[PDB]
């Protein structure tokens, strides 16, 4: 069972930049104007995403 | 209340204007207890008791 799906024109890859996307909420604790340090996984401040 | 997934109010270090996590949630104020020390004023045992 083989399906022939070939592409004659392939679009070249591009680079997408992002500033402030990818910072979630691991904890459900509210913080009414307090400064706290986090240690989790995040997307960088400046980078290129596929 | 402000937003659903976070409701525990606290502003500086210890005020913690909430309780823990009620089903009705929402936050009003803080007044568990607050009282201080005491000192004694004396004029002198050989002067008065
Ligand atoms: C019971 O839960 C409901 C939420 O639907 C709300 O009225 C309150 O948080 C609780 N207490 C009473 C008396 O309803
Ligand atoms: C207290 O006062 C009296 C009179 O002023 C004095 O004789 C005495 O030495 C003082 N001290 C004591 C411990 O009584």
Residue B28 near residue B17, CB atoms below 8 Å: yes
- Shortest CA gap B11–chain A (Å): 5
Measure the CA–CA gap between B3 and A33, rounded to whole angstroms.
14
Method: cryo-EM
Measure the CA–CA gap between A28 and B21, rounded to whole angstroms.
11
CA B17 vs CA A9, A37, A50: distances in Å: 61, 21, 43
- B36 is written with which tokens? 């201080």
Measured from the alpha carbon of residue B45, the closest ligand is 2
Q: Cβ neighbours of residue A7 under 8 Å, at least 6 residues apart?
A: none
- The position carrying tokens 């402000």 is B2
């Amino acid at each position: 069972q083989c399906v022939n799906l070939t592409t004659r024109t392939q679009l070249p890859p591009a680079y997408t930049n992002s500033f402030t996307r990818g910072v979630y909420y691991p904890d459900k604790v509210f913080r009414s104007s307090v400064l706290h340090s986090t240690q989790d996984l995040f997307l960088p401040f400046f980078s290129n995403v596929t | 209340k402000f937003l659903p997934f976070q409701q525990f109010g606290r502003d500086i270090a210890d005020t913690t204007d909430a309780v823990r996590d009620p089903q009705t949630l929402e936050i009003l104020d803080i007044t568990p207890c607050s009282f201080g020390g005491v000192s004694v004023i004396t004029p002198g045992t050989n002067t008065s008791n």
